[PDB]
Design a protein around this nucleic acid. Structure first.
Lengths: 67, 465, 46, 54, 123
RNA sequence: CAUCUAUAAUUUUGAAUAAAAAUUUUGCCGUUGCUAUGGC
């Protein structure tokens, strides 16, 4: 009964670069920092945009794991 | 053939239905109805039939059940979907058939049809858990035995009408296909204190919210069979939970007497505490008596996105709004004072005067608790129930800064565990059917001084206009 | 076995009766009868 | 094995507060307080299963 | 004209402190709950103090006990509801008597001592 | 879920036993009668 849970926060528009930028919340019980490629897929589908068009960098995994 | 023109034509049939009903009502309005309908998804309370119901002549009926201690019920109502106009009902034969689900402490699960407002809920099917499901191993990694073996506590049907989920002290969630009433999956809760206490689905969704005695609210996604999130923060047990469409839930955690509203997506719980002050209350009434303290908190549900109602254990019924931390308005012993125990019994002695002087008068009087509290979403009418055998219907003041008594229904007899609401008929005249699961005992323990002459059953209240 | 069980039950109930029947200012045969009938119905349950 | 509500704590000099004093409990991801057992239990059970199967 | 055989009995605030302390105690197993449990703690000399209810039928079942309490110098209180006491002590049937036991290795220590002194002041 | 079979009402021979074409309040116990209810 485990599965990644994806959330956005501080969604900010950016017409200057024609983009949206924000912080991503990735709850993951029984997992080790769900990989960036799948994250790209899931955010891309959520925001309806293109897979390689969405981009993500720079995670940290809180001590004790899970988030 | 095309999806686009399929939607177009279906919304057409919707629209000539609308205009035909406009002609009917005339024998503007279209836009107003459309605005109400769509804006349902957001905003404050808007259904304003508080003064429209015809309460005194409500058709009242009671039905017995073949077992004891009906602890919970939940009614599911397929709705003409406003997004895509087929239905909320899944199968063609369902065609908008109204369903009721009952769970009883005898490890009893029942599916009733309630499609008619005159006749009684017809027992479509039943299932029984037994001791033949006790897991032989105790590691609890495999609590995967597919039947109940200890004290079902509550039930809720996924508002898509496909599955029904039930939970009890046996630290498991059991999800069943509706029409066969068949156990499709077990979800262990995986903890030794983890008796499930209450369940609620997020409206029109797949999310399920299990308030667990592990001080926690576990949160699941049904059709993915997944445990989404496990939120923390209460002090003692969590007792009641309810929600609406938005990713918000409300839980009263009892003994620490706190009422928390969890906004999930941003991961934040706003906290409410009661705490009426008896000395101030008595002096305020001297400014012109029995003022009981909030021992615990038991039952909560939300009318809307910003206001909600809380049931104490000492008669207090409170309207809270998100902004002010205190309850914006509060109501006293409303379910009335529980009777004075018999003099002869309480004394165990011959001198009637000794019996009275041991009754000690007022200092022994005690209030009715609050057992079932519920509201129709975004309405301005809410229903309160105790074991006084009398449901109390209340209307929120259209200011949303108070509420008043609308009326009484004396069809109940015994402990009112759960209240649920169904609506049918046309929009102009909606026929309400309120279903009250009544048992002889409380939901959780027995704890109750053998209330006189009660029956495990269903109390149906059909109200018109 | 059942003998010990019913005996212990009666022991508890007579402790009850003694408690009330001492500490009151006067006793209550009817309340005693209530306890008697309760124990009798349990014995019948056997 | 024992965590303060959300975080897992392996720091036995916490200096708890009152809210914490209530929230301390077993940790959701540790075999005393949650999911599948630890490695020595798994090894012993595996040895039992192997010796019984042979 | 005579005080009733239940005196003392607490006001609602003191009811709150008593029941809450009882609940935490029952969750931390410093608590012997049950009338005979109470009498036997009193005998064994390991009791911090004694709560009991003043609505059980009859009242004399537990009215016996404060005799032991007064002789042994331990305080006692009557809360106005066995039902409430049961729901707060965490068992299935109404409870009419309970005893909070001694042990200083108690994470509710100061709580219980303050409440006990409140009781002593009530008397 | 849909289909199909049978059960439950019709279409027809028909008075129909009958042969034929299609369709779609209770675990126990007690009180009450033109459904209501009480006790465990």
């Amino acid at each position: 009964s485990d599965a990644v849970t994806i959330r956005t926060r501080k969604v900010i528009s950016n017409p200057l670069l024609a983009r949206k930028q924000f912080v991503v919340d990735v709850l993951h019980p029984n997992r080790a920092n769900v990989s960036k490629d799948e994250l790209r897929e899931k955010l891309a589908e959520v925001y309806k945009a293109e897979k390689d068009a969405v981009s993500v960098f720079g995670f940290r995994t809180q001590f004790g794991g899970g988030k | 053939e095309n999806p686009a023109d399929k939607r177009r034509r279906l919304a057409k049939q919707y629209l000539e239905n609308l205009k035909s009903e406009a002609n009917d009502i005339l024998t503007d309005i279209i836009a107003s109805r459309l605005k109400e309908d769509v804006a349902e998804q957001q905003g404050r309370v808007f259904r304003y039939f508080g003064d429209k119901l015809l309460i005194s002549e409500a058709k009242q009926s009671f039905t017995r059940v073949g077992e004891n201690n009906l602890t919970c019920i939940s009614c599911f109502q397929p709705v003409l979907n406003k997004y895509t106009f087929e239905e909320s009902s899944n199968g063609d034969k369902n065609k908008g058939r109204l369903f009721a689900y009952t769970v009883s402490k005898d490890l009893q699960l029942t599916k009733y049809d309630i499609t008619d407002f005159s006749k009684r809920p017809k027992k479509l099917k039943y299932a029984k858990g037994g001791a033949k499901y006790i897991p032989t191993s105790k590691h609890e990694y495999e609590n995967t035995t597919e039947g109940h073996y200890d004290e079902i506590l509550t039930v809720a049907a996924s508002p898509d009408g496909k599955y029904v989920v039930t939970g009890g002290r046996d630290r498991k969630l059991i999800v069943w296909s509706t029409e066969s009433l068949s156990p499709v999956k077990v979800i262990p809760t995986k903890d030794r204190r983890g008796e499930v206490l209450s369940l609620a689905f997020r409206k029109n969704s797949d999310q399920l919210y299990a308030s667990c005695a592990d001080f926690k609210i576990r949160t699941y996604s049904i059709n993915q069979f997944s445990q989404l999130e496990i939120l923390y923060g209460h002090h003692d047990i969590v007792e009641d939970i309810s929600a609406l469409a938005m990713e918000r839930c409300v839980t009263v955690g009892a003994r620490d007497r706190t009422a928390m509203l969890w906004k999930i997506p941003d991961e934040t719980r706003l906290t409410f505490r009661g705490g009426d002050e008896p000395q101030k209350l008595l002096r305020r009434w001297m400014k012109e008596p029995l003022f009981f303290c909030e021992g615990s908190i038991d039952v909560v549900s939300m009318v809307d996105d910003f206001h909600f109602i809380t049931g104490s254990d000492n008669g207090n019924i409170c309207l809270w709004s998100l902004a002010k931390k205190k309850p914006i308005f509060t109501e006293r012993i409303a379910h009335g004072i529980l009777p004075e125990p018999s003099f002869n019994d309480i004394s165990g002695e011959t001198d009637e005067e000794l019996r009275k002087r041991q009754l000690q008068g007022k200092k022994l009087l005690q209030p009715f608790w609050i057992t079932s509290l519920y509201a129709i979403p975004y309405s301005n009418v809410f229903i309160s129930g105790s074991w006084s055998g009398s449901l109390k219907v209340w209307k929120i003041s259209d200011n949303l800064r108070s509420f008043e008594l609308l009326g009484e229904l004396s069809g109940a007899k015994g402990v009112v565990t759960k209240i649920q609401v169904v609506e049918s008929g046309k929009h102009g005249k909606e026929k309400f059917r309120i279903l009250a699961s009544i048992a002889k005992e409380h939901r959780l323990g027995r704890w109750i001084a053998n209330v006189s002459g009660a029956r495990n059953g269903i109390y149906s209240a059909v109200i018109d206009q | 076995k059942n003998k010990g069980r019913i005996s212990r039950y009666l022991a508890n109930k007579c402790s009850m009766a003694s408690r009330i029947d001492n500490y009151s200012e006067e006793p209550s045969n009817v309340f005693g009868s209530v306890l008697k009938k309760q124990v009798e119905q349990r014995l019948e349950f056997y | 094995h024992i965590a303060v509500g959300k975080q897992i704590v392996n720091i036995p000099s916490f200096m708890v507060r009152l809210d914490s004093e209530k929230h301390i409990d077993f940790a959701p991801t540790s075999p005393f307080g949650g999911a599948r057992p630890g490695r020595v239990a798994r090894r012993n059970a595996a040895r039992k299963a192997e010796a019984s199967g042979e | 004209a005579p005080n009733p055989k239940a005196f003392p009995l607490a006001d609602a605030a003191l009811t709150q402190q008593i029941l809450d302390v009882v609940q935490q105690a029952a969750n931390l197993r410093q608590l012997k709950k049950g009338a005979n449990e109470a009498t036997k703690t009193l005998n064994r000399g390991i009791s911090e103090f004694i709560i009991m209810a003043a609505d059980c039928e009859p009242i004399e079942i537990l009215l016996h006990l404060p005799l032991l309490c007064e002789d042994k110098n331990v305080p006692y209180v009557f809360v106005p509801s066995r039902v409430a006491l049961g729901r707060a002590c965490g068992v299935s049937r109404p409870v009419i008597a309970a005893s909070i036991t001694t042990n200083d290795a108690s994470a509710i220590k100061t709580q219980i001592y303050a409440v006990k002194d409140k009781i002593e002041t009530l008397l």
